[PDB]
Amino acid sequence: FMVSLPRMVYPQPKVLTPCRKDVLVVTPWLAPIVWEGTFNIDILNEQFRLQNTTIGLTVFAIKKYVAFLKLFLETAEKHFMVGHRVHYYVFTDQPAAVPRVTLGTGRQLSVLEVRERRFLSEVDYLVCVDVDMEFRDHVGVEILTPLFGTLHPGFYGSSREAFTYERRPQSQAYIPKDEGDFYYLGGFFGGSVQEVQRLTRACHQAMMVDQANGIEAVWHDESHLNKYLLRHKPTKVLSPEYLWDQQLLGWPAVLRKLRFTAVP
Numbered sequence: 001f002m003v004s005l006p007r008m009v010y011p012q013p014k015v016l017t018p019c020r021k022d023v024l025v026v027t028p029w030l031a032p033i034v035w036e037g038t039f040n041i042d043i044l045n046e047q048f049r050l051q052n053t054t055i056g057l058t059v060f061a062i063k064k065y066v067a068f069l070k071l072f073l074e075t076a077e078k079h080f081m082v083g084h085r086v087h088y089y090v091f092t093d094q095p096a097a098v099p100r101v102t103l104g105t106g107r108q109l110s111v112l113e114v115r116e117r118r119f120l121s122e123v124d125y126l127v128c129v130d131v132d133m134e135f136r137d138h139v140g141v142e143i144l145t146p147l148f149g150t151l152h153p154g155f156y157g158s159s160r161e162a163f164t165y166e167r168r169p170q171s172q173a174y175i176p177k178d179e180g181d182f183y184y185l186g187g188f189f190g191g192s193v194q195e196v197q198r199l200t201r202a203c204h205q206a207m208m209v210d211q212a213n214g215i216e217a218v219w220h221d222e223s224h225l226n227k228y229l230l231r232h233k234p235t236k237v238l239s240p241e242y243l244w245d246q247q248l249l250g251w252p253a254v255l256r257k258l259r260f261t262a263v264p
C-alpha cells in the first residue's frame, strides 16, 4: 500500500519537449535509462521515503583491496542514498583492517568475514559494486527498481558486434554476434533482494557448469551477468554516469555528471 504524495511545487513536465535529444532514455522494453536531466529527485525521494526504503550496499575487499575501503565508504556517506536507510555489507578476509568510518544517522555497516535469508529481512534493495571506486556525485533512489544493470563506459557507443561478450558456444555465457542490447558492467548492478539473488544464483550455477566443462568465460562474472541481463531484461539501465574512469576516458559532453568513478 502506497500513501499519497504531499503537495509539491516543481517545473511542469513538457510533453512536446524531449528530455534529452542526445541520448536514448528508454529501452525497447520500456525500461528507463537513467541520465542526469531525466528525473526529478525530489519526487523520487518522496516516493521511496514514504515506503521507508532500506538500501543494502555490498562490496568485497579481499587482500590488498581493503585499502580502498576508507575512500569508498567516506564518499558513499556524502553521495549514496543520503536521506534514506543504508546498510553497508563489507565482505573481507581482513576484518580488523576495515577502517573506522563515521556514518550518518540511519546508516549502518556490517563486516562479514570470508575465507542469503539475512538480506531478505534487512534490506529492500541490494546494490553490488566494485570497491576500488569513489563517489563524486549523487547516486540515489533514481536507480532503484526490481533489476538494473549499468552501461559499461567502454562500450556504450559500440555496436553489439564489438561487445566483448563470451563468443564460445561451449560456454553458458555464450551470446552470438546477432544478439545483445548493451554491454553491462560487472561492477555495478542491483535490484530487489529477490531479483539480485535470482541473478547471482543463475550466474553461480552457470559458472559451475562452465568449470565442469573446462571453460572460463572471457570476462568471468561480467560475461555471465551480460547473458543473464540479455535473457532477463533489466527494469532500469544506468548510464555511464554511474561508473566511469576519467583517467582512461576523460569527461565527454554526454556526461553531465560523473557520479561513481575508478580510483587510480
Ligand SMILES: CC(=O)N[C@@H]1[C@@H](O[C@@H]2O[C@H](CO)[C@H](O)[C@H](O)[C@H]2O[C@@H]2O[C@@H](C)[C@@H](O)[C@@H](O)[C@@H]2O)[C@H](O)[C@@H](CO)O[C@H]1O
Residues within 6 Å of the ligand: 152, 153, 154, 155, 164, 186, 219, 222, 244, 245, 248, 262
Ligand atoms: C583498461 C582495461 O584493462 N581495459 C579497457 C576496457 O575496460 C575493460 O573492459 C573489460 C571487458 O571488455 C572488462 O570489463 C574490464 O574489467 C575493463 O577494465 C576495467 O574497467 C575499465 C573501465 C578500467 O577502469 C580498467 O582499469 C578496469 O580494469 C575498455 O572497455 C576498453 C574500451 O575503452 O579499453 C580497454 O583498454
Ligand SMILES: O=c1ccn([C@@H]2O[C@H](COP(=O)(O)OP(=O)(O)O)[C@@H](O)[C@H]2O)c(=O)[nH]1
Residues within 6 Å of the ligand: 059, 060, 061, 062, 063, 065, 129, 130, 131, 132, 187
Ligand atoms: O576483493 C575484491 C577483489 C576484487 N574486486 C574488484 O575486481 C576488479 C579487479 O579484478 P582483478 O582481476 O584485477 O583482481 P581479482 O578479481 O582477480 O581479485 C576491480 O573492480 C576490483 O575492485 C573487488 O571489488 N573486491
Ligand SMILES: [Hg+2]
Residues within 6 Å of the ligand: 018, 019, 020, 037, 038, 039
Ligand atoms: Hg527531461
Ligand SMILES: [Hg+2]
Residues within 6 Å of the ligand: 058, 126, 127, 128, 196
Ligand atoms: Hg550483492
Ligand SMILES: [Hg+2]
Residues within 6 Å of the ligand: 058, 059, 060, 128, 129, 130, 186, 187, 188
Ligand atoms: Hg559486486
Ligand SMILES: [Hg+2]
Residues within 6 Å of the ligand: 199, 202, 203, 204, 206, 224, 225, 227, 228
Ligand atoms: Hg548468469
Ligand SMILES: [Hg+2]
Residues within 6 Å of the ligand: 200, 203, 204, 207, 221, 224
Ligand atoms: Hg558467479
Ligand SMILES: [Hg+2]
Residues within 6 Å of the ligand: 199, 200, 203, 221, 224, 225, 228
Ligand atoms: Hg552474475
